[PDB]
Design an enzyme around this catalytic site. Structure first.
Site, PDB file in Angstrom:
ATOM      1  N   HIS A   1      17.727 -15.451  22.541  1.00 28.11           N
ATOM      2  CA  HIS A   1      17.870 -15.689  23.980  1.00 28.11           C
ATOM      3  C   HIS A   1      16.538 -15.632  24.696  1.00 28.11           C
ATOM      4  O   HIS A   1      16.399 -16.136  25.819  1.00 28.11           O
ATOM      5  CB  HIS A   1      18.856 -14.680  24.634  1.00 28.11           C
ATOM      6  CG  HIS A   1      20.157 -14.564  23.917  1.00 28.11           C
ATOM      7  ND1 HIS A   1      20.410 -13.566  23.000  1.00 28.11           N
ATOM      8  CD2 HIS A   1      21.251 -15.363  23.930  1.00 28.11           C
ATOM      9  CE1 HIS A   1      21.620 -13.751  22.497  1.00 28.11           C
ATOM     10  NE2 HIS A   1      22.147 -14.840  23.040  1.00 28.11           N
TER      11      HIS A   1
ATOM     12  N   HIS B   1      11.687 -14.191  31.147  1.00 33.48           N
ATOM     13  CA  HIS B   1      12.623 -15.244  31.491  1.00 33.48           C
ATOM     14  C   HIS B   1      11.826 -16.316  32.186  1.00 33.48           C
ATOM     15  O   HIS B   1      10.852 -15.997  32.875  1.00 33.48           O
ATOM     16  CB  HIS B   1      13.684 -14.735  32.455  1.00 33.48           C
ATOM     17  CG  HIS B   1      14.496 -13.631  31.888  1.00 33.48           C
ATOM     18  ND1 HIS B   1      15.659 -13.852  31.186  1.00 33.48           N
ATOM     19  CD2 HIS B   1      14.297 -12.293  31.891  1.00 33.48           C
ATOM     20  CE1 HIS B   1      16.142 -12.699  30.779  1.00 33.48           C
ATOM     21  NE2 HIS B   1      15.334 -11.738  31.195  1.00 33.48           N
TER      22      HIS B   1
ATOM     23  N   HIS C   1       9.899  -8.661  32.047  1.00 35.15           N
ATOM     24  CA  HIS C   1      10.595  -7.380  32.086  1.00 35.15           C
ATOM     25  C   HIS C   1      10.106  -6.433  31.015  1.00 35.15           C
ATOM     26  O   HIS C   1      10.178  -6.743  29.817  1.00 35.15           O
ATOM     27  CB  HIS C   1      12.085  -7.577  31.923  1.00 35.15           C
ATOM     28  CG  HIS C   1      12.712  -8.332  33.051  1.00 35.15           C
ATOM     29  ND1 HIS C   1      13.910  -8.986  32.923  1.00 35.15           N
ATOM     30  CD2 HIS C   1      12.292  -8.554  34.318  1.00 35.15           C
ATOM     31  CE1 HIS C   1      14.225  -9.550  34.077  1.00 35.15           C
ATOM     32  NE2 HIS C   1      13.251  -9.321  34.934  1.00 35.15           N
TER      33      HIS C   1
ATOM     34  N   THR D   1      20.085  -7.874  32.554  1.00 38.93           N
ATOM     35  CA  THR D   1      20.404  -9.214  33.029  1.00 38.93           C
ATOM     36  C   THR D   1      20.964 -10.114  31.939  1.00 38.93           C
ATOM     37  O   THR D   1      21.182 -11.297  32.179  1.00 38.93           O
ATOM     38  CB  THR D   1      19.197  -9.859  33.715  1.00 38.93           C
ATOM     39  OG1 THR D   1      18.106 -10.028  32.788  1.00 38.93           O
ATOM     40  CG2 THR D   1      18.764  -8.958  34.841  1.00 38.93           C
ATOM     41  N   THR D   2      21.250  -9.526  30.783  1.00 38.44           N
ATOM     42  CA  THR D   2      21.831 -10.227  29.663  1.00 38.44           C
ATOM     43  C   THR D   2      22.982  -9.427  29.132  1.00 38.44           C
ATOM     44  O   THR D   2      22.947  -8.205  29.179  1.00 38.44           O
ATOM     45  CB  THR D   2      20.795 -10.427  28.495  1.00 38.44           C
ATOM     46  OG1 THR D   2      20.107  -9.206  28.217  1.00 38.44           O
ATOM     47  CG2 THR D   2      19.760 -11.441  28.878  1.00 38.44           C
TER      48      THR D   2
HETATM   49 ZN    ZN Z   1      15.401  -9.276  31.114  1.00 42.92          ZN
END
Ligand code: ZN
Length: 257
Positions: free
Chosen positions: A61, A93, A116, A195-196
């Site tokens: 991801h 991201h 992050h 956030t995932t």
């Molecule tokens: Zn993240």
């Protein structure tokens, strides 16, 4: 399985991960008008002087730079936090074009990417235990703003050819995560989530006001990675950002203001 396309992207995650529609989801839009000062807040104390990077991994991801979190070589303290939080990894991201890609937004403004730096609270012993607790994780968010080439970032991007597909890893020693921080450490903070998936509601978010730079050319390199494993059909890692989630009951605070 989950991802970022129309069908398996963020809008669908709630089906397999109900907490996606919960009360402290991230990211959020930071409306600077609603941001409040709080005299309890402190300057952020980052101590990355002994930080020891081990490897870089395509997890299907995104890609992670992993740190040795067996001792206190790379710790985060103060800011909004109580206790010591160890750096375990960082990842990014980004979006399919330079006008989009950040997860947090500022007065609706988007950046090209967002970094992050994930940290876990040592009072919980390990990341897995910490990840289940409301005060368990702290993530520092750093905006990547398109402009001049970033030479610190270039060392990370040079390894990306070696981890194109899902599950690949390469040894990545000697990278200083402090080199991807801005000079000023003003921040916004709010209680939020990963956030995932699994979207755990265990994160104190520390979003830095000042971005670091990145060139348009460099942004193209992020987009060379694959979501797919070798031997599966190619799915290019062009975009892997979750959009803003509703703020709900929460207050965003700012330091120094
Ligand atoms: Zn993240």
């Amino acid at each position: 399985h989950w991802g970022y396309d129309k069908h398996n992207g963020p809008e669908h995650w709630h089906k397999d991960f109900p907490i996606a529609n919960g009360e402290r989801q991230s990211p959020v839009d930071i409306d600077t008008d609603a941001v409040v000062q709080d005299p309890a807040l402190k300057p952020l104390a980052l101590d990355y002087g002994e930080a020891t990077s081990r490897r870089m991994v395509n997890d299907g991801h995104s890609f992670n730079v992993e740190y040795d979190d067996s001792q206190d070589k790379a710790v985060l303290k103060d800011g909004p936090l109580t206790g010591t939080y160890r750096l375990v990894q960082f990842h990014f991201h980004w979006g399919s074009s330079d006008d989009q890609g950040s997860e947090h937004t500022v007065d609706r403004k988007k950046y090209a990417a967002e970094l992050h730096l994930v940290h876990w609270n040592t009072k919980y012993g390990d990341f897995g235990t910490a990840a289940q607790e409301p005060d368990g994780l702290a993530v520092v968010g750093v905006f990547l703003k398109v402009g001049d080439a970033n030479p610190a970032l270039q060392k990370v991007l040079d390894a990306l050819d070696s981890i194109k597909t899902k599950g690949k890893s390469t040894d990545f020693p000697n990278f200083d995560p402090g080199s991807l921080l801005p000079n000023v450490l003003d921040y916004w903070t709010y209680p939020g989530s990963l956030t995932t998936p699994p979207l755990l509601e265990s994160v104190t978010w520390i979003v830095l006001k000042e971005p670091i730079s990145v060139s348009s050319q460099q942004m193209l390199k992020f987009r060379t990675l694959n979501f797919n494993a070798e031997g599966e059909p190619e799915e290019l890692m062009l975009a892997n950002w979750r959009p803003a989630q509703p703020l709900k009951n929460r207050q965003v605070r700012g330091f120094p203001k």
